[PDB]
Amino acid sequence: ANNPEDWLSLLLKLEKNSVPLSDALLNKLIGRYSQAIEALPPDKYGQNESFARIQVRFAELKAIQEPDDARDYFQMARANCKKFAFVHISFAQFELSQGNVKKSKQLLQKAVERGAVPLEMLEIALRNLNLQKKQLLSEEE
Secondary structure: OOOHHHHHHHHHHHHHHOOOOOHHHHHHHHHHHHHHHHHOOHHHHOOOHHHHHHHHHHHHHHHHHOHHHOHHHHHHHHHHOOOEHHHHHHHHHHHHHOOOHHHHHHHHHHHHHOOOEOHHHHHHHHHHHHOOOOOOOOOOO
């Protein structure tokens, strides 16, 4: 039961059950994500897609709850789950949303250089960044 897949399921369910979201419910959800991260050693889960999702969701929620403090959580996810393109792109999306366009591009280029996968997701993100779109990946992409 202490595995990322079971944790991710519980966390997605909690969020589904918390709609319509309030400040109070969001704080509770963020607290539960932290509890998952306290329970899952990153060492054995560096290539685990659910663990990567847990960390990215935590960073993305912190970007809502505390955007001026959220950078380190994206750095955390990237340090722990570097193989996944979606992790780098989430970080790049955060930097872009903060107006940090050059940083967003640097992050995406470094992911490509380091062979994060799938490459096509990175190429789409770089395309949209160059077109100056607000979202590196559309909801439909």
